[PDB]
Amino acid sequence: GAMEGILDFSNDLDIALLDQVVSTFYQGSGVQQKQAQEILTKFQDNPDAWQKADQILQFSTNPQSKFIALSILDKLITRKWKLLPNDHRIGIRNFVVGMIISMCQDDEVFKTQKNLINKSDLTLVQILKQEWPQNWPEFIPELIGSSSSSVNVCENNMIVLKLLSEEVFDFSAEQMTQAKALHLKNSMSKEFEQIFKLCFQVLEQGASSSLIVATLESLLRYLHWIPYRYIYETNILELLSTKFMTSPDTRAITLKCLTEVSNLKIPQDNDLIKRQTVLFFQNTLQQIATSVMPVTADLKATYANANGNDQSFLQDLAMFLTTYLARNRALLESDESLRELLLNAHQYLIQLSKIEERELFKTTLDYWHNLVADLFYEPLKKHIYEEICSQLRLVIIENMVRPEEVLVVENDEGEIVREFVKESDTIQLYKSEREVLVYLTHLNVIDTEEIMISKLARQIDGSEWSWHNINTLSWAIGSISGTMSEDTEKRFVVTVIKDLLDLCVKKRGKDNKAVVASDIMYVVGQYPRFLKAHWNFLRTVILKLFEFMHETHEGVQDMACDTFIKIVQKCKYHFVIQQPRESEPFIQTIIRDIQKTTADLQPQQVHTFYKACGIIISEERSVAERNRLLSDLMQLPNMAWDTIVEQSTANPTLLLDSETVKIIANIIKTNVAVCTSMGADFYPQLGHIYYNMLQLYRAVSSMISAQVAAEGLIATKTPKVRGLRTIKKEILKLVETYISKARNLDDVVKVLVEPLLNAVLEDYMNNVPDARDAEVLNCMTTVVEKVGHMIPQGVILILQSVFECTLDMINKDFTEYPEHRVEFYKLLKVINEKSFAAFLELPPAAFKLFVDAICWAFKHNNRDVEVNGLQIALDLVKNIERMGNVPFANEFHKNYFFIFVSETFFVLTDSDHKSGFSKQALLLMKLISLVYDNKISVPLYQEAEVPQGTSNQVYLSQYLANMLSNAFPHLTSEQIASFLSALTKQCKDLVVFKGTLRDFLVQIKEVGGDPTDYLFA
Amino acid sequence: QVQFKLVLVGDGGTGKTTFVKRHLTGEFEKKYVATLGVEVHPLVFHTNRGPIKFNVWDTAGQEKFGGLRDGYYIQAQCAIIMFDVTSRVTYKNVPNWHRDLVRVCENIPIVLCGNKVDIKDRKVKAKSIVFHRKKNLQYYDISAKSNYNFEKPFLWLARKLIGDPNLEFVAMPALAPPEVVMDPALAAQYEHDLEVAQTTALPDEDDDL
Amino acid sequence: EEDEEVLYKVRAKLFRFDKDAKEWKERGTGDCKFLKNKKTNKVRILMRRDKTLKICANHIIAPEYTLKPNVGSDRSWVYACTADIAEGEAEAFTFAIRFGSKENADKFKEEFEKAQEINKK
Lengths: 1017, 209, 121
Ligand SMILES: *[C@H](CC(=O)O)[C@H](C)[C@@H](O)/C=C/C(=C\[C@H](C)C/C=C/C(C)=C/[C@@H](C)C(=O)[C@@H](C)[C@H](O)[C@@H](C)C/C(C)=C/C(=O)O)CC
Ligand SMILES: Nc1nc2c(ncn2[C@@H]2O[C@H](COP(=O)(O)OP(=O)(O)NP(=O)(O)O)[C@@H](O)[C@H]2O)c(=O)[nH]1
Ligand SMILES: [Cl-]
Ligand SMILES: [Cl-]
Ligand SMILES: [Cl-]
Ligand SMILES: [Cl-]
Ligand SMILES: [Mg+2]
Description:
- Chain C: Interacts with GSP1 and PRP20.
- Chain C: Important for the export of protein containing nuclear export signal (NES) out of the nucleus. Stimulates the GTPase activity of GSP1 and GSP2.
- The complex is a heterotrimer of chains A (1017), B (209) and C (121).
- Chain A has 1017 residues and is mostly helical.
- Chain A has one domain.
- Helices cover 72% and strands 1% of the residues of chain A.
- Chain A has 50 helices and two strands.
- The longest helix of chain A is centred in the C-terminal third of the chain and has 29 residues.
- Chain B is an alpha/beta fold.
- Chain B has six helices and six strands.
- Chain C has one domain: Pleckstrin-homology domain (PH domain)/Phosphotyrosine-binding domain (PTB) (PH-domain like, Roll), CATH 2.30.29.
- In chain C, 16% of the residues lie in helices and 50% in strands.
- Chain C has one helix and six strands; from the N terminus they run ββββββα.
- The radius of gyration of chain C is 14 Å and the shape is globular.
- The two termini of chain C are 21 Å apart.
- Chains in contact: A-B, A-C, B-C.
- Chains A and B meet through α2, α4, α7 and α18 of A and β2, α3, α4 and β6 of B.
């Protein structure tokens, strides 16, 4: 089309056409906008487009065209500046400087084209990064001089200086070499005296102005790095904390500056300086109180109204107060004349903490944590803050977020229902709130108890009754478990529970009952110490939870299951012993009525119930009695299993019933649940089902294969086949779970392993890729982890069965079979760690695939795979080194040393694997250090490639210089030589070695990097 | 009408396009196809203060596909900065995106979003996410996949842009749908179309819905 | 929806078949409602997305429609719709709708077919 004309560089650039394409992109829509975007990107990306920038800036009537011209120049300056002839560098500097001057001296342009002038300023700063001060020594003096000729120019100079400071001090770490960063920081430092003089003069001579605001914005950046004498040995603190707090346009930026002043490195034992730190805080707070709002103001209301910049101001005030006080509140704590200031600042924080804004609340809460943690330890301090702390108790008790355990919530229609999903984003908030409230309780347990107990009295008598109010209070009560002595706690908990039960009697309807039930469950579950000391109560609580397991309210039902196991995890001992005045241990009572108790539960809830029983049974350390309890617990699943094993062995067809498949899955899931809590103790139950379970695995495997054969790969998506695979997956999970916890490893090897490998390995190998369970790999990882050292032939069998076929599934792209990918490398990792001899036994062709697989893992951007790839490589190198001077090791180095070096360099330098930098560097350092230390016993070069006596050190340098020369042809020979010299010298000092790598990664992104940068030290 | 330019920025792979698509069509795109430069889509929400239209400029996070880069930000009226809670480098780069953005857009409302909270192995800890505080950005944990908090960034931005802290999304009016019959001639191809649909499995059959 | 009686409501995930790609694409999750207009006695499906409340299905439950199973699910139905106006102008779709359980799916079919009989009257 017509817009594409600007891409033809054989003709003059039609600037009017360019302006039309730009306007179509920014202001148009749909297909035309999309086409214009594509054309502009192609235009921008033309390596000759920079040659058009001057013409565009001169003749365009579209500010966006000019912005894009500047972006083109930015790319040139940042990547190819030193490729340019010197006259082009001078010309570009001249027209950028001239454009800036021209736009500043025209008032209408300076007012209306801020975006373009800011972009021009940044582009100038890119030129300074290349040229200044070595080839632009008078830049700063001339900037300072030019500031007096025009207020527009002066203001713009403050923007330039802000951007320069940012680029040098805030954003240089990733973008410059260590040497270049030091040069520019030193250069700014050396001329800062004159910069500050300009800034201070401007601040002295004005009150409220766009110039003053720009100057203060620059000051904010300088505060990141300048010496504190500029702030404390001038009158600048007075100006910041008085004059500039009074006008709202300067107040925002001044407050941010004062926050950074509070972070300056300042002498610790100077009374004069301490006085100045107190004074600026005193001044600032006086200005807040007189010009903004008094300490009594309702900041919750102000924030919620959201006028102008009020939300940002209140945020910035919170940041200022918390920052200053966390560092300096001790300066205000001992002098009686400073007590009012200290308490007023904290009172503002109390008011800020009432604001409804979760992220701001986290900020103030972090401060309260800092304060209360200090008051918990520091003698003679807590009394100072007793009124602040008392108010804070109310704030926190009234703003407690719903705990993860409380599974009911009010819907939009006013009904109390089970939550749809977990509120994952309040997990940390709750922990932080609990932390602060626990400290506050410790600081004054009488105040805390009085507040909670009187709030509960107001729920009962109805004056303050609401779901919100009973919930937050109940959550607060639960959250402070552990703060009181057992005896004090005993009285507190009794009072609370009696009152919650009274409250329940009074409140009717399923919504009310669900809310109060949830609160009682939360509280009782949080006080296991109390439960342990009160058996009759505990027994009665558990019986009530069993009643709730029949609730039609699914939230209350599910919470009862969770509360049951939460209590059992802490109180299990009391379920296994025979309590006084009981006829049997309560575990016997539970097991005997388990069918009735769990009848209305969903399967996963039944499994949780069985898991809890397992926790209790493992309390019995007499083996005969424990095994009998396990047998009793498993009676119902074992009886169902026995009947199915009878049927299925008669008929492979009876297993085809979907109802039977579901029954089997749930039997195995029940076994998994109990094995999870019983671990090593589960063995007798595993032995009861083991051989028939593996026969069932084979039978189900046959059904799956038959279905795929008869119906196609689509069969794997059907409910029937997914159900059958669930059986296989749960069997694998059961075995993995047991072996992971097994204490008798002789039995694992002698009884479990051979039949397991027989049942699972050939089946995995001989199924089509889409029917292979990644869970097989996961199970084998645990087998090798726990008993790999005892089963060398078994480990070889595992590799033969899963290695080549799994590699072929995952080596065509980085995305297919994501679970197999991840489990495959976990398996190779543990085999390489525990049974390296298995890799030594591979045929050479398979060992080559192993090296290929490791390097393939490096290239993943998926962290689960990448990290394991890099670890396997490092472990493999270590394994080879441990063999010493033997033929396998010598051949390994001859075949693979340079493969590992080159592949590691590739992922280090391609900008697509930045997450792996640290482990890549570790690997490269290990490889280089092998040659530096002469640990490779044979030549790495074939003979006649280099003279016969040549060291591996000399050859490694030659190889690497050639590799880098060809891969990075824009580097000079000396850049490459200097880099390699430094890198090789630094191969015993990881932090320095990594710095050298980072410097190389900077230099490869540009032309003409200084080779002396690699001498940085 | 009442329409606002929104720019979406953040590292490649963080879920920017997937997040927008979810809002546009309801779908969850499982594949990672890198955005080339920028994709612009209009996106309308119905509120108690009337409709609000965002013109969403979904920018490329991969350096090699960045296109006009900060040129996309010109005249943006709001923004979302995205990272991935399962990738620490993406949070480490948030200050870089923010720097480039605010240099062009000096006073706009910006939401920072930590995406992919559905993934079990979270790497950027909740406690670590503090960059937004001094920069006055709103922050939310989100998941385009589970829809966790998916509406929050747009609700907050709408409130800031309209200047009404009590603005809420409301149910769009639902016109009476038409009475129509399938034309007989098409019925033969509809049989084929339905067979293909019936025999293509629905995704994520282990999900709650 | 002021002039309409809610005959049935169930939580559901709705998909549309993309025939150009060869895949199902989610259109929305939320409450699927069968609404009977009190003036005309016509019954429609109206479904809105959680949180945003955007309409993801709005069509008459036509007597001609037939619910069919999907190969991968025992808790879903697929059917051709010839006139859905969720996105604006009436458009034809192949929909799939999935529920929390088989029991809900079977109840949906029962209610769907009752609604079809009402629309025949
Ligand atoms: C609604 C009840 C209603 O409708 O009236 C609520 C939601 C209830 O359904 C839920 C109750 C739950 C637990 C209760 C706390 C369990 C009750 C235990 C109980 C009454 C135990 C007896 C044996 C006691 O020990 C009594 C006599 C004693 O006073 C207790 C309450 C305090 C103690 C132990 C004092 C002491 O000195 O030891 C939901 C889990
Ligand atoms: N698990 C999970 N995956 C997600 C989520 N959001 C996006 N993804 C996945 O992340 C991948 C990348 O998503 P995409 O939206 O293309 O990322 P992007 O930020 O637009 N990348 P680019 O900047 O290169 O255009 C896709 O595979 C997508 O399915 C999420 O919330 N959870
Ligand atoms: Cl511009
Ligand atoms: Cl000085
Ligand atoms: Cl115990
Ligand atoms: Cl050279
Ligand atoms: Mg994208």
